Design a protein that fits this description.
Chains A, C, E, H: This is Holliday junction branch migration complex subunit RuvA. Chains A, C, E, H: InterPro entries: DNA_helicase_Holl-junc_RuvA_I (IPR013849), Hlx-hairpin-Hlx_DNA-bd_motif (IPR003583), NA-bd_OB-fold (IPR012340), RuvA (IPR000085), RuvA_2-like (IPR010994), RuvA_C (IPR011114), RuvA_C_sf (IPR036267). This is part of a larger assembly, with 8 copies of chain A. By secondary structure, chain A is α+β, with helices and mostly antiparallel strands. The first copy, chain A, folds into 3 domains: 63 residues, Beta Barrel (OB fold (Dihydrolipoamide Acetyltransferase, E2P)), CATH 2.40.50.140; 75 residues, DNA polymerase, domain 1 (Orthogonal Bundle); 53 residues, Helicase, Ruva Protein, domain 3 (Orthogonal Bundle), CATH 1.10.8. Helix content of chain A is 47%, strand content 16%. In chain A, strands 4-1-2-3-5 form a 5-stranded mixed β-sheet. Chains in contact: A-B, A-D, A-G, B-C, B-E, C-D, C-F, D-H, E-F, E-G, F-H, G-H.
Chain lengths: 191, 135, 191, 135, 191, 135, 135, 191
């Protein structure tokens, strides 16, 4: 239910940390990497993952949707718990873990704290193939293809505005527009 | 306990979406139609249903007392599949469903994915006259 | 955990209603009486009572601490659930129910929707005596014994302030001060 | 998931108190001492511990990582009695407790109400060297 | 595990009875019909059906494999318990119940003590088709097709033995031999 | 499933006894009276009651449909204590019990060990008119 | 607790058979092969395995410490399917199985009915070096 | 329920063995000692102890009531299972274990396979005192105090019968009669 949260890093820890979102001091565990790049006092967003139990409720935080994704997916397997999933996530980088998970590197998995011999195997055979659409490379947008379009246009002659004023109108009739397909199509209406 | 949630759709995504409700990202699964209709980046209120599990909580937002109601009704059978639930609610509009559920139309239900003859067949029977007039 | 909440009465119902506290639309059941004296649109405070389950979580609201108290106490008994406890609370007034519960009117209990024959009995034998400190009469403070003190003083001669200015100083050295014990003790220092 | 709660003490009351945390009245049971010390009507932060049950959630606020820590430690035994837990934490100050727990002093624990010889006796054993130096 | 048992009918009952097999007095419930055709004192065989629980173990007895069969099959359905299954079995004859169960007479099912409206339906939709190989007519062998063969042979001329002495030898080379296919084939070797 | 067991009392012993039933030593707990009356080394039939548990089976032999019946009846309440059960059946004869149970006499039940006022008090209520005439 | 049962095969029948063990008809499911080999009307001893369930007991007789052993081994995985168990034991002889299980041969297991690639695939892994030399 | 059993030792094992009582081959675990003094082929009595579970039923056998006693008592403690209880029983002799258990030798307990450090302690603190009436020395009757009486009498003069014929009559009026109290009391009636 709780997936995202914003608040102060109130106080860190070995494998946990506390987020003062609202007026509530939430306590969530996270991967060492993420955990370290975490500094008390500054606001922060966290991709959380609730988790019931038989004695209480648990919160697990992550740097970005990607991570969260694996953590879940990971928990998806029978036998793998938060600790392990966390280990794996705390050991090798997501991207590399995504691949590994897909392909099935029970070898590479073992190669990481919480190093599970046969477990790394189950987790492997178990998610081979079953992994992942947009998850082999951390989603990251470059530059404003829009502006980027213009910027090109300007340097190609066309007085800025002339170029920007029609790049926009282009993104209108067609929101999807890689600078390329955008830029070109401008030359057309800029003949 | 959550029945209604009104806030920003922080991010549509697949079978669900994230709704911001005052510093807290709530994640709800919801009917494909609704799902697509839903425009991210803006506000929205959605009559929801909080569902607990071995894992933990699971929210389900819908556009009205309407869909919600069918969702909940479908949930009380055996193929309680919120999946199936959502399966059905995604394939047939509330009106056709309610009329189908009620007049027990298995010769339709099957549209939903995952609802073979059997399930639907023994879904209508299970709900024989449980589908409230309000349709 | 959740005991109190403030928000709009978003939408009422047969035996339930929704409280839009925060940005969340919480749905809680309440006693018919309380329920009716409830009007969509106006802010309201609710003495809530969470309740886990095996399929979801449930919220039960109440007019005042008193009620909440019984509702719990009620649930305290083996076999009595929210519905019943609610019935009982929805039927006869708290005060009368508090008494009844104490004394043991399995007769009076039955005498109320959800009218349980032997249940009214269990619930009776079961809480006989086990009920309640400050719960035989809805807690309700009268007038500002403080001011009330003064007000008397003024009408007894003493120019207001003279009287108020020392009633306060009296509540200082001694916060607990029924107008009586307060008033008198003023005449002393007002000789 | 709640570990820290900082807000207005809406109402001290008996074995607990109500803390206002942004439009929501949270209710926490807590150690008698703390409890009395606690002045209602003002602000307060309290390191808490959320405990689930058949019934449902139960919060437990304490004044420090300190008490909290002992509370939690005591909770993991068998006489997991948050009652007993609170029983002990109310009778002996964290220092004496931790030193007692650790050096396993049953010849003390019994002060707490509900902790007969047996329980305490088999509480020290259970925690033999589980009481962390930090005392 | 326990399916069959032999012992005295030690003492009967409303819907139960006790079988003293071994030295143990076993107590099993059975269908009224079967139950009535049961008389204390005489040995008897029972087609039993154990059944664990959360408070004890239960034994359900039946006249013949056929019945037992239905009782189980019956229990096979979700929601139908021993009581109901028993009712159904205690009401209409197996054969007719077998048919009904196959075809799906939620109408005929209801038509019987423990008369379940929608239940008779579930039980119906639920076992439609899923019922039963050799279970539409109580298995019952006629006469010794073997001897029967002979008996015919004798009356057809052939001195008894001559006929019997070769019927046997026929059942040898071929155990499966309806009197017909048996008899004929004798005339051949009796030419 | 065992209701009657008839065989040699291989060994009386404390709160139970061992009965030989064709190469198998069965062990039954039973009412003190019966228990003492019982002469070991000889034969005996005893209407029993097999009770399952977390641990496992538990037999309870009694001298008649009579006692058995009360034993079983008492077992269905909450203080299902076959102990309490046996407690009561050991203190009061079936007749007085049945008449007590039925006319709900708590002013007696207490004789049994372990049955405080409360239990007995809320044992009669629980069985108000459940005690079958046959007394 | 039953490991061996030796008595008359009162009636072969389908996926099981009834064995008479001194006035008591025991019913055991068993491997098809064994099953057919089995001649009804005569005696037989069969190393068994008693399995409890929600329903209740379930016996499983086999012809040797051999098959029994594999049956039991297969039972401890996840697709604990005594069905699958029997499925496998019916398709491959103990020797090939044990050698297959052990050398983890999924490129075979699939013969058994109900054992798709996946199951078998994650049956060998589960038993990697659990298959005892004795083959 | 099952406490005693007689049958052949059909086949032994590492920590188990099979008893063919009736026609059933029962499989029960026992203590190594007991286990070893066990030889396939010979009849034997076993002090058994059933034990349900969530996957099957378990049988644990013992040499004599004494042992069985401890095994149970042992299981009585929270955390100690059949294995451990068995270990303990398989390690040190009952008598010594009975004492130990009473007194509380967490030291001596540890001193035995399944050597539990803190467990030996729990088991200790836990049964200290709570152990055992007639269980500090394996119950074992000497000689027929009766005959023994006589035998003395004869050697003291009195012609055998004369002595035996009145020892019996003595055990009659008084079954409880240590040879001593028996013998003497004979001299009286043999004056």
């Amino acid at each position: 239910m709780i997936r995202y949260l914003r608040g102060l890093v109130l106080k860190k820890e070995a494998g946990g940390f506390v987020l003062l979102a609202g007026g509530v001091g939430f306590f969530l565990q996270a991967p060492t990497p993420f955990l370290q790049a975490l500094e008390e006092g500054k606001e922060v967003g966290v991709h959380t993952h609730l988790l019931l139990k038989e004695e209480g409720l648990s919160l697990y935080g992550f740097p970005d949707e990607e991570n969260l994704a694996l953590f879940e997916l990971l928990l998806s397997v029978s036998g793998v718990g938060p600790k392990v999933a966390l280990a794996l996530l705390s050991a090798l980088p997501p991207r590399l873990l995504a691949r590994a998970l897909l392909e099935g590197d029970a070898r590479l998995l073992t190669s990481a704290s919480g190093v599970g011999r046969r477990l790394a195997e189950r987790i492997a055979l178990e998610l081979k193939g079953k992994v992942p659409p947009h998850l082999l490379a951390g989603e990251k947008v470059e530059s404003e293809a829009a502006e980027e379009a213009v910027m090109a246009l300007a340097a190609l002659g066309f007085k800025e505005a002339q170029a920007r004023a029609v790049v926009l109108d282009l993104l209108a009739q067609n929101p999807k527009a890689r600078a390329q397909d955008l830029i070109k199509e401008a030359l057309k209406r800029l003949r």
